[PDB]
Design a protein around this ligand. Sequence first.
Ligand SMILES: *C(=O)CCCCCCC
Ligand SMILES: *C(=O)CCCCCCC
Ligand SMILES: *C(=O)CCCCCCC
Ligand SMILES: *C(=O)CCCCCCC
Ligand SMILES: *C(=O)CCCCCCC
Ligand SMILES: *C(=O)CCCCCCC
Ligand SMILES: *C(=O)CCCCCCC
Ligand SMILES: *C(=O)CCCCCCC
Ligand SMILES: *C(=O)CCCCCCC
Lengths: 173, 173, 173, 174, 171, 173, 174, 173, 172, 172, 171, 6, 6, 6, 6, 6, 6, 6, 6, 6
Amino acid sequence: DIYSRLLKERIVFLVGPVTDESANLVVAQLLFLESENPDKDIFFYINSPGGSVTAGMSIYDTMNFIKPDVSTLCLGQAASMGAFLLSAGEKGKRFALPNSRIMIHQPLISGGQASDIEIHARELLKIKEKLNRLMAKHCDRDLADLERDTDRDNFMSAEEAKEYGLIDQILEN
Amino acid sequence: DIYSRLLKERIVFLVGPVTDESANLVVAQLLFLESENPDKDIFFYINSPGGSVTAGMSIYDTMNFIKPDVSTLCLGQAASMGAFLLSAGEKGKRFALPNSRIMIHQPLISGLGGQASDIEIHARELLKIKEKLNRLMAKHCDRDLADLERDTDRDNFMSAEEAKEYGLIDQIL
Amino acid sequence: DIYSRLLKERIVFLVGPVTDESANLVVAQLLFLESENPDKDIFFYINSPGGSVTAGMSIYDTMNFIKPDVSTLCLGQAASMGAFLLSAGEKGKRFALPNSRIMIHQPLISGGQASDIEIHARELLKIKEKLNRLMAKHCDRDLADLERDTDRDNFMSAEEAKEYGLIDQILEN
Amino acid sequence: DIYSRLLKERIVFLVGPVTDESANLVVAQLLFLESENPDKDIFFYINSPGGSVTAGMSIYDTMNFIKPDVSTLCLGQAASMGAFLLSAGEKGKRFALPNSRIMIHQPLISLGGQASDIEIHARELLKIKEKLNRLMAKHCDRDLADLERDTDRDNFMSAEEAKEYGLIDQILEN
Amino acid sequence: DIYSRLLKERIVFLVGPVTDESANLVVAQLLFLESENPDKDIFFYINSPGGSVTAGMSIYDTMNFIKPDVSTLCLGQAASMGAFLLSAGEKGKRFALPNSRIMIHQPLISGQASDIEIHARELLKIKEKLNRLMAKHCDRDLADLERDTDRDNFMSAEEAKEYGLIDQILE
Amino acid sequence: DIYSRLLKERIVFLVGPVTDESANLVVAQLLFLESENPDKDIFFYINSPGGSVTAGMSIYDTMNFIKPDVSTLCLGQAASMGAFLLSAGEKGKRFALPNSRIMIHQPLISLGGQASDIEIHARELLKIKEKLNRLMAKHCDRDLADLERDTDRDNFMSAEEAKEYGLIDQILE
Amino acid sequence: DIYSRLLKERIVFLVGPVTDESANLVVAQLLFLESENPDKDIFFYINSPGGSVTAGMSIYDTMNFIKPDVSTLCLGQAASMGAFLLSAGEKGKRFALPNSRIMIHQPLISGLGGQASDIEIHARELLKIKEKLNRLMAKHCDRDLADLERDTDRDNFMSAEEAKEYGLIDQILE
Amino acid sequence: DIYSRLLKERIVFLVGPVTDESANLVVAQLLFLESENPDKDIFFYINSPGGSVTAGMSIYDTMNFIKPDVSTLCLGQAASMGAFLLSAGEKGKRFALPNSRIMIHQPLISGGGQASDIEIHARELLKIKEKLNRLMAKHCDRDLADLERDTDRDNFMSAEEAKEYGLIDQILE
Amino acid sequence: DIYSRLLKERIVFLVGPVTDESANLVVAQLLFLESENPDKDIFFYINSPGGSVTAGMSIYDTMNFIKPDVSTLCLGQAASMGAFLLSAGEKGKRFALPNSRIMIHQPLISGQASDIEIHARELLKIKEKLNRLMAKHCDRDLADLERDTDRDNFMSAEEAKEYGLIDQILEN
Amino acid sequence: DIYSRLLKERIVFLVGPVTDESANLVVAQLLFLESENPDKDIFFYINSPGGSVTAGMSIYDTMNFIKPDVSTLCLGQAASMGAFLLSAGEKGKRFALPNSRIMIHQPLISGGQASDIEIHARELLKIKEKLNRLMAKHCDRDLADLERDTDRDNFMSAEEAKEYGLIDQILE
Amino acid sequence: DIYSRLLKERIVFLVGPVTDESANLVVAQLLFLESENPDKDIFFYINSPGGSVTAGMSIYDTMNFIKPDVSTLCLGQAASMGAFLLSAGEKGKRFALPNSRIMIHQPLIGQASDIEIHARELLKIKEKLNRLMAKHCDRDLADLERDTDRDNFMSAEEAKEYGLIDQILEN
Amino acid sequence: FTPXAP
Amino acid sequence: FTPXAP
Amino acid sequence: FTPXAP
Amino acid sequence: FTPXAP
Amino acid sequence: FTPXAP
Amino acid sequence: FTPXAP
Amino acid sequence: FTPXAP
Amino acid sequence: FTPXAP
Amino acid sequence: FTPXAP
Ligand SMILES: *C(=O)CCCCCCC
Ligand SMILES: *C(=O)CCCCCCC
Ligand SMILES: *C(=O)CCCCCCC
Ligand SMILES: *C(=O)CCCCCCC
Ligand SMILES: *C(=O)CCCCCCC
Ligand SMILES: *C(=O)CCCCCCC
Ligand SMILES: *C(=O)CCCCCCC
Ligand SMILES: *C(=O)CCCCCCC
Ligand SMILES: *C(=O)CCCCCCC
């Protein structure tokens, strides 16, 4: 196919929601390209509304484990875990297209006994704090910045994202 | 019309789930029976699987506010808020029939929630409801708070004899 | 019936959600009770989770228009529009039972064109500010307090509601 | 019941949607109150999100035909046909409670089949739209152009904005 | 009751759809009001979107059978069978309110070719009966009503008076 | 009520489908009117789309057993079993209003299990078909072959066609 | 697969309902077989409960247009449009298997629609389809048009012997 | 693949219900195997619950038409039309496995309109019932009356009962 | 598949509803066939109940833009947009099979009064456009097509040729 | 097959709704064609009713980023984001077929707290403002013009789209 | 593919429900493996919750008909007809993995005449299944009538004591 | 409905 | 509605 | 709602 | 609820 | 189905 | 469909 | 199933 | 679509 | 997307 020809050039796509299946598909391509050449950069193109935090963490840990720099690029949108993975690119190599959209927010879901609800509520808050801390690192900001700015849905243009620290450059016409 | 002949004898029934509707019907009868005679006992017959925590609390507060002693009697079963109201009768005047059933447990939810902040808020409210119910029922039973925390962790089914030992009723008719 | 006969003692109930039917039934009883005697207090008993803003406003304006003082008492719970109506009682005559619950929050919703969504969003934000302003009046607090404290679901015990300025007295056994 | 005892004082309620069945109940009561006394005012209390145009016209025309002045009062809300009937009270006797809400807008629908049939129904809807704008302009003493402009989308009004617009005459205060 | 007091003044209402049930209640009141006095007029107030043609025909035949003149008045709307019944009032005594709506149209529907022909043939007969009778009401021809009900025909009170379906508009 | 005053003039209605419920309501009224006066005619007004053949037979056998003549009149329509009952009136006393409609057709259902059971019910359906065609041929003074032909499919008739057919006697201006 | 190997022997199948899809699939194979040899017969095996009149009519016209004789064979059943197409084979080359059944009937619709004018229109088209099929199938069977008018009035089930007696096929294979 | 490998040894399967698809696939393989070698027996393995009568009849007539003897063998089960096709094998070469099950019954429908149409289809079903009994009597070398008695309701047979009945010849090892 | 072999004889099929999806396949085949030889006719076999107006228009404009004559043939039926496309074939090269049927009709369908009016106008523009174009295809007066498409209009092959909608019925 | 044969001549299709995958297929072909020759024009054929704004923006940014001119052509229809992408072609190289239809309109939607509804309403208006401004540049008109003319559904003939500035030339 | 490579080693899988479709796939592979070599064992791996009795009987009769010994092995579970087929392996060659689960039970599922017929047919299946499995387990029939009365869950070791498998494969 | 029923 | 109905 | 309606 | 409501 | 088809 | 289409 | 089928 | 696209 | 990715 053509997508095979894009992988030939070290381009990996994440299009649509991040699920266990799509996440593991990205992981397989990352490991594969590093197998083919551990010394050339990889280009991770992201147009995603988000999805499973767990699946995204699987992509994240793979991006950081392999030797090659993983450049990230947003086309269309990078929202929630998609924005998370975008900000996780190699610093200096995180890009967005001019009319791309970035959105970040605290975790949201849509249980049983009071003990169980407390357990899952506490787990969700750990996820919230972990995601805020990692993204504070990505953006070179104070953790209080991300706590404040992800409280509700935070929509950003590419320039607002460049200024926030989530990407580095905006690709231009 | 049979139910009014029993109300004239100061018998009030709670049959079925504790809802805002059934709860307020009991409150009106409690207020009615007090106005007719603030000096004679009221007899609150309970055959209920439980229901709304708040709706039951409106019954509870009325039972404690009025001048008459509210005697409680369990027939069939008294579960969750049904058991709570049974244990809330005047001490010395909480009764059960020989094959009645009592069950107590911590609160539970059918669903829930959207954002991590919101789920955190409702987790706390539900844990507050849990601790309140254990504290109050520890007083009703003349038992330690630690006992009730242990004994509502999961569904706790009791015979009339197990309920009398526990402090939840006074005698079996 | 018996709700009849509590109405004979100038007690009006609001049980369950606030709807156009619940409201105009309450408004009618208020007009009737004022007709029977415009100079004796009326007692508005509230056990409600909330409902329609416009229907609650119809009770509210009726409570303020009639000559008799409208005392409010919360039994079970008064949440959202129900808590708004509770706070609207004559100051000094707003009551709660010991295990009552109060909850307040900003407006909530369960549009087509962007122009139409813009319009309905203004109407929703106008409603939010109006409700926050009026309750700041009811509670003798700053608008910023109500703005801060209705941001998410805010559950209050009877003692917290009295501190807040939302009720005047907790009734005791 | 209590609603019966409100009818003894010449108050008629419209609560909830305007339907053929709610409309004719109101119409009958208006004829009844006129039958009991053609010379005393009638008091039309409105809390409605709107409803059927034709059912609303049936109430409207009765208000205008009978001898008694029909005073109108908004509590809660008067939207779409509810606001129309609100504005239709005897001028000087249209009231709203302080936190009442008014909304007016052009007709809405949710259509059928052949292009001929759709042109017929669109043309009828525009006639309905134009009639409602003309009549509302008269009730408010404004230009048709105002109501054409101001009903293009949902127009929510506080009680003071409705008095400014000409839809009511006075806000009833605490 | 309010409706009993209106019936005492010889007012009969048809509000909402024309069904066998709503039709027979009107038919019962017509026979009753004639029973109470065969020499006073009856006043038929109509606010209806239409309904069953057969059910409406039972009202129509009853209106034409009894001695009292049945005046018709449209408030709100009289559409389809409701308009048919409106035009059937005593000529000179068919009224509409200023903002009333009248609508007339040909019949509407929502097996074997033989069975399909039969029901098509019956539907066209019903269409022709309704067009003819209403032409008689309006003092126009069958061809007129065939043209003017071919698709939905919405009419104001003045258009309905001009068409011959009502006589007068009440101030 | 209104239907009460019509019954005292010995008018009985069948409005809507012929069901066990509507049929026995007709049968009860027929017996009652004969009870009050076994010598005055009864007037059976019919506006019905048809219905259960068995329920129709209970009305029919009642009409033929009681002492009074049961006149029938069609207003609106008499279709299927409704047309059967219309034709079943006392001969000389079966009427229709000018724009009444009569419809007659062979039986219809909406089978089955084993071929033996289908054979049994097919045979039972044809006996019902022939019984109704034979009986109606007598009502109309026609040959069974006439009714077999003319109920083969739906046969819609004006009042004038029904009188010409023998199904009614005379049309009321 | 096996069906292509059957196509090499100039056998075309119609199995199941006659649809625009199955019809054009058959039509393509008829045109293909004519292209490969315009002078050898084609063998049309039919096991179908019927289906669309226009889709069947598309197959019918292709059978009559091409040069090769189209022999037809019924196995299982040929009902409605399936029976029509069976009867449409070259006279002398229309076959049935011994326990095959043929069924013929007038057109029928699932379920009708719009205004009375439109229903008149579709009834009229339906009766035209009904008459054309009776006329054509009488010609296929060498019978009076009146016979087919009577015999398709309702579902007419035929054994293979009965179909040969009727004129719809020529020969039962043993 | 594997089912294609059984076909080279002249094995044809009927697995599952008898429908127009499975039937002509079986017919196609029968015609195919005959073309390849019209002189070797064909082995028709049947594990089927029954199904369409006309579809089964096309298989049957194909079995009788082609030159090869068609042996039938039951594995799993042969019920209704499946049993019909099993018994239709070449006499002397109809087999079943030791724990195979055979069932025969009269025709059955799951779930019409006018009495004329119902009668026609009932008549058609009874013709099918009679055809099926006669052919199966010939297959089993029995009197028609035996099969009429024995297909009246569901008739389950062991492999031994099936050979004793005449429906198979031979139970394998 | 055999359908490719029909394409080598320059046969393009439209079977079933006219959709964006079926339409663009027809459009693509027409462009390919012009690419293969812009001077040889194309034969468009149509068996369709109609469908999307815009999708049919994309086929239509492609028939008119490419150099080769596009002959059309109706087998089974050509109704609505299918009859429109049939009538759009090269004049003199529009054919029908003897028992095919043709049907033509005005446009059909399945907010705020302003929104309904906008869509009512667009629907009437489409109606008038289709009536004018069909008048050009059939060499008739616009008044004919306005009257003749008011409701569903079923035509036999002989009637379609008489109307100007096709040129010739294939007899063999 | 045929669609890849069209790709050899640097033709890219968008048929049907604009979704993340129909968009990323187009983006992949655009990057591929630039890779094959960064100096020849690309021809983007659009028959689409609209779809995801973000999905369309990815195509849009790709069209503007790559070196080759992207010519656009509307066949059948180009509505909403389909009209957006059509107008985004290289100026001078935006075409439509004669009976093509263009439609433009403001964004529309089919939720939680008032704070949350405010955030999403504001974002919807920014998207509305961004689309109007970008399309105003494509047409050499003003943002205020596009706000007036997208307020409700705006259907345009090919001839109206050229007058408006969304296409340059009608092919006949 | 991977399952093809396992068949080359004379391994056939039965995973999931026993249906007419899966049963005939196993039967075909059994016939194929014997034709490839009638003198080497076949290894039948079972992870199944059960299913159709007649479809399982189809596999069973094939296991007993072909010349090669059919070894059976339970991994995951062998329940209902799956347990029947497990117990049906060549004796001395029926295996289970350490944490497999075995379950055995009675069969489980108109006019009264028809219901009697099917009740009688179901009872025959119950008695045959008990008799055959008693033979497979070298136990007395009364044990199986007692022990399949309700769902009987067995560890690999309880299954080995029961006579249902021969060896548990160690680690 | 008289005359004649009743 | 009088005058004149009634 | 008096004064003044009624 | 007296005293004091009522 | 030969003889004779084919 | 030849002659003549094609 | 051989012998004998096949 | 050539000339001119392409 | 080059320069620079790749
Ligand atoms: C026919 O004219 C019968 C009238 C009946 C009148 C009884 C009163 C309801
Ligand atoms: C028209 O003005 C009719 C009035 C009816 C009055 C009677 C009230 C019950
Ligand atoms: C406005 O003040 C109306 C009051 C009406 C009172 C009557 C009570 C039923
Ligand atoms: C609070 O104590 C209210 C008591 C109400 C008494 C009235 C009896 C129906
Ligand atoms: C009738 O005997 C037809 C036989 C066809 C044989 C071809 C096999 C693929
Ligand atoms: C009309 O006669 C067309 C015939 C096509 C022949 C070639 C089929 C692949
Ligand atoms: C009965 O023994 C069948 C044997 C079939 C062998 C062929 C395997 C592909
Ligand atoms: C416009 O004329 C495009 C033509 C493309 C031809 C390529 C053939 C597949
Ligand atoms: C950015 O310009 C990347 C382009 C990749 C081209 C490779 C084609 C598969």
